[PDB]
Design a binder for this molecule. Structure first.
Ligand SMILES: C[C@@H](c1cccc2c(-c3cnn(C)c3)c(C(=O)O)[nH]c12)N1C[C@]2(C[C@@H](CN)C2)OC1=O
Ligand SMILES: [Zn+2]
Ligand SMILES: [Zn+2]
Length: 232
């Protein structure tokens, strides 16, 4: 009923959209992993009479449900998708997307890691993102590689028309008490990577984490704080 949808509010298999700004939505889905249920976010950005998708909905069936929810709520075709790192909450569902006419993209680093680990593999490589601080345009967004954080390949996405910063899993929600799933993280570099984001996007108005509630710029400092304390 208008609040940001939360883990116990979304059954696994269902997807909800949330309007962030004009032409910008997040998508929210839930999934089971190692016997616990988690929410996760992605992004939808209007690209003329088409849509750009950022990240899958964490699984094939969730991603099919995402496409159906987009058709119901927005009614414009998803033509391209970008996955912001190699984990299943970002690429699981890429095969569904490809079979539904969506061209799927990720950095070469993400594609290599997905392949090596047995995750679904985006079709197209995004060059120009291999060095921290790199940025490239992709339709209505800018893609930025901040350096290693949650993963070595994590990308962030900025929507300049709306000053929306989608941090993906390199950015944690304000209620977070831990650095999330750190299996593939670089806790030592993470605060430096967040500092790069802060420097590059000082006018961000909305910051969206990979999991949990959007907020403002304070999500970036909070993330640095909880990663440093985790490492400690
Ligand atoms: C799919 C994703 C994942 C699974 C379950 C929980 C989380 C969370 C999370 C947990 N708590 N909160 C608040 C968020 C985050 C996050 O932090 O992005 N990702 C998660 N995987 C799995 C993996 C690959 C490794 C294989 N050995 C383990 O690593 C990840 O990230
Ligand atoms: Zn991850
Ligand atoms: Zn994640």
């Amino acid at each position: 009923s208008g609040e940001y949808p939360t883990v116990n509010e979304i059954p696994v298999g269902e997807v909800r959209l949330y309007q962030i700004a004009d032409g910008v939505w997040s998508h929210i889905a839930t999934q089971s992993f190692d016997g616990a249920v988690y929410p996760s976010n992605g992004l939808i950005v209007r690209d003329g009479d088409e849509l750009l998708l950022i990240d899958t909905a964490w699984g094939a069936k969730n991603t099919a449900a995402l496409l159906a929810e987009i058709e119901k709520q927005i009614g414009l075709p998803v033509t391209r998708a970008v996955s912001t790192h190699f984990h299943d909450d970002r690429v699981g569902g890429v095969d569904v997307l490809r079979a539904a006419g969506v061209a799927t993209y990720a950095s070469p680093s993400t594609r290599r890691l997905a392949e090596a680990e047995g995750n679904e593999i985006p079709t197209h490589s995004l060059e120009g993102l291999s060095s921290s601080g790199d940025a490239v345009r992709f339709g209505p967004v800018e893609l930025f590689y901040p350096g290693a954080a949650h993963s070595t390949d994590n990308l962030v996405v900025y929507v300049p028309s709306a000053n929306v910063l989608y941090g993906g899993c390199a950015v944690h929600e304000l209620s977070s008490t831990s650095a999330g799933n750190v299996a593939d993280a670089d806790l030592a570099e993470w605060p430096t990577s967040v500092e790069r984001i802060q420097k590059h996007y000082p006018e961000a108005e909305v910051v969206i984490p990979g999991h949990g509630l959007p907020g403002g710029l304070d999500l970036l400092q909070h993330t640095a704080n909880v990663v440093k304390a985790h490492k400690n």
